[PDB]
Amino acid sequence: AGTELTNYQTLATNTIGMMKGVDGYAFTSGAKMTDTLIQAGAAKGMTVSGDPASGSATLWNSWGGQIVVAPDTAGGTGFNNGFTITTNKVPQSACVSISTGMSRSGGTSGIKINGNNHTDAKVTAEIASSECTADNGRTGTNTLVFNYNG
Amino acid sequence: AGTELTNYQTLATNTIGMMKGVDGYAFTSGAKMTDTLIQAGAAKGMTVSGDPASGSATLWNSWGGQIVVAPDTAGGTGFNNGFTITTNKVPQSACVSISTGMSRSGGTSGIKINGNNHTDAKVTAEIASSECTADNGRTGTNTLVFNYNG
Q1: Which parts of the chain are coiled coil (chains A, B) (predicted)?
Q2: Which of B56, B72, B125, B127 could disulfide-pair with B35, CB 3.0 to 4.6 Å?
C-alpha cells in the first residue's frame, strides 16, 4: 500500500496548496472540490474517470473504491476550515497499512476508520487491525477518512 | 515560465544540498532521488503525486510534464558524475526563456534542449529559439535537461 499512501499524501499536499490561494469562496460539495482538484492535476497517480452528472470527473483508489475530497463544513468566520479525503471499499490489509502509515506521516489533523474517529491523528497497527473490517470475498469493506487543517 | 525557472533553480540548490548530505549511500534511480527530495520538503508549491510502480512520490511541471531528478551514471566512455533535472512537454515559449534563464543564472554544468547538449552551460535565446521545437496545439514538445557537476 505504499503507492496508495503516497497518493493520499501528495493529494493532500496539492489540495492544501490549492486552498491557500482561495479566498471569498469555498467548495460546498465533494464532487466539485474533487473535479477541480482533478482538473488542476493534483491526482495524477490515481485512477481518474467520469462521474458524471454535470461534467465532473471522479477519483478512484487501487481497488475501485471512490476517493472524494470534500470541504469540512464550509464556513465559520475567519480562516477557511479544512477538508477531508475519504477513500472507500478499502481491503483489510490496506486499511491497516494506510491508516497507520498516514498516522506516521504526521500530516493529518485526524484519521477515521469506519465509525472510529481518531481525532488525535494517532492510529497504531493494534488499533487498525481491530477497527479495519474483513473483506467480503475480493471486496474491501473499510472507509478511511483523512482530515486536514480542519 | 518564470515561476518554472525559480522552481528549477530552487530544486537544483536543494538537490545539491541533499546529495552533499549523503554519506555512505548513493541514489541509483531517478524515482528514489525525486522521492527523497519531495520528502525533504524540496518540492512544496509544485504539483506532486505518487508513482504506481514504486510507491515513490513524483514531480510535475506546470504544463503537466513530468520532472525527474536523477543521479549521474557510467556508460563505458564517460563518467559525468552528479545529477540531472529533466522536465518534459515544455512549451516552445517557456523552453526559450527557461533554458536561457538557466544559462544566465542556474549554476549548471550543462543545459540540454532536446538533442542539443550545451556542455558549456551557455544557451542564448537565439540558440534556444531554433532548438526549441514548436507546440502541438496546446502541447509542448520540448525536453530540457539541466546537468549538475561537470
Answers
A1: none
A2: B56
In the DSSP assignment, the letter for residue A135 is P
DSSP bridge pairs for A60: A47, A66
Q: Within chain B, how many helices (H) and strands (E) appear?
A: 4, 7
Chain centroid to CA A132: 16
Residue B73 falls in which region: left (phi positive, over 0), alpha (psi -120 to 50) or beta: beta
Q: Which long-range contacts (CB under 8 A, 24 or more apart) does A111-114 make?
A: A111/A144, A111/A145, A111/A146, A111/A147, A112/A143, A112/A144, A112/A145, A112/A146, A112/A147, A113/A142, A113/A143, A113/A144, A114/A142, A114/A143
Distances, alpha carbon B110 to alpha carbons A30, A83, B77, B146, in Å: 46, 43, 18, 6
Measured CA distances, B128 to B1, B10, B115 (Å) = 14, 22, 12
Q: Does the distance separating the beta carbons of B58 and A44 come in below 8 Å?
A: yes
| 3.30.1690.10, 1.10.10.60, 2.60.40.420, 3.40.50.1820: CATH of B1-150 | 3.30.1690.10
Asked whether the beta carbons of residue B50 and residue A17 sit closer than 8 angstroms, the reply is no
Are the Cβ atoms of A10 and B54 closer than 8 angstroms? Answer: no
Q: What residues of B are in contact with residue A5 (Cβ under 8 Å)? A: 50, 55
Q: Classify A44 as helix, strand or coil.
A: coil
Which technique? X-ray
φ, ψ at A38 (rounded to 5°):
-65, -40
Q: Give the list of residues 6+ apart from residue A142 with CB closer than 8 angstroms, or none.
A: A89, A90, A91, A92, A94, A95, A113, A114, A132, A133
Residues 6+ apart with CB under 8 A from B93: B1
